[PDB]
Write a protein that binds this ligand. Structure first.
Ligand SMILES: CC(C)CN(C[C@@H](O)[C@H](Cc1cc(F)cc(F)c1)NC(=O)O[C@H]1CO[C@H]2OCC[C@H]21)S(=O)(=O)c1ccc([C@@H](C)O)cc1
Lengths: 99, 99
């Protein structure tokens, strides 16, 4: 749908049979999820934001259903305060900014 | 306009007579700008991100021209890696998410 920005743009996601709520984040190049139970192989990686850097697990070709729109891409898992859906997955559901 | 998210959604802003480039960031509740010299009084504050917290100066009722659209609101200035246009100002220019 069309989302106004008067509140945090949170959506219900389905990942690994698990339901979570995540932030549609146009300021994020990639998707970063709070620690969760994810299956498969991964390779260590670190990401930086406001306040510094955190160490994350990099998972590729991860299925995630975002508000009924399905996308597959890299998902990072680590000590983020909030689940954030970055542009790597927003592009797959056809998300655009409009002003 | 309408912006696809295949690249970073960067726009030209004019604040304090200075031209800069900022990220239209739906994941930010607040506007945070890289170090710059802005006129007026300010108030210390702490903001939190992925890596932790940074100390910024809070400036209120600051005029900002975002891609030709004028907005006034609180602007924070501090050691952010990138200039961020948050939801406090995106709502004023009529910015929406679309998927
Ligand atoms: C600094 C920008 C360019 C990058 N970031 C995106 C922003 O949108 C964050 C999102 C966020 C929200 C939050 F609630 C907690 C939190 F930790 C992060 N916003 C933010 O820091 O906003 C400030 C100002 O507003 C305030 O409200 C919200 C918190 C406060 S990032 O997440 O660091 C990031 C994402 C992806 C990667 C890689 C994997 O691509 C690297 C880094």
């Amino acid at each position: 749908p069309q989302i106004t920005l008067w509140k945090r743009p949170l959506v219900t996601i389905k990942i690994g049979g698990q339901l979570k709520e995540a932030l549609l984040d146009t300021g994020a190049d990639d998707t970063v999820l709070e620690e969760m139970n994810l299956p498969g192989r991964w390779k260590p990686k670190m990401i930086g934001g406001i306040g510094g850097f955190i160490k994350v697990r990099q998972y590729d070709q991860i299925l995630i259903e975002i508000c009924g729109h399905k996308a597959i891409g890299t998902v990072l898992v680590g000590p983020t305060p909030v689940n954030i859906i970055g542009r790597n997955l927003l592009t797959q559901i056809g998300c655009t900014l409009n002003f």
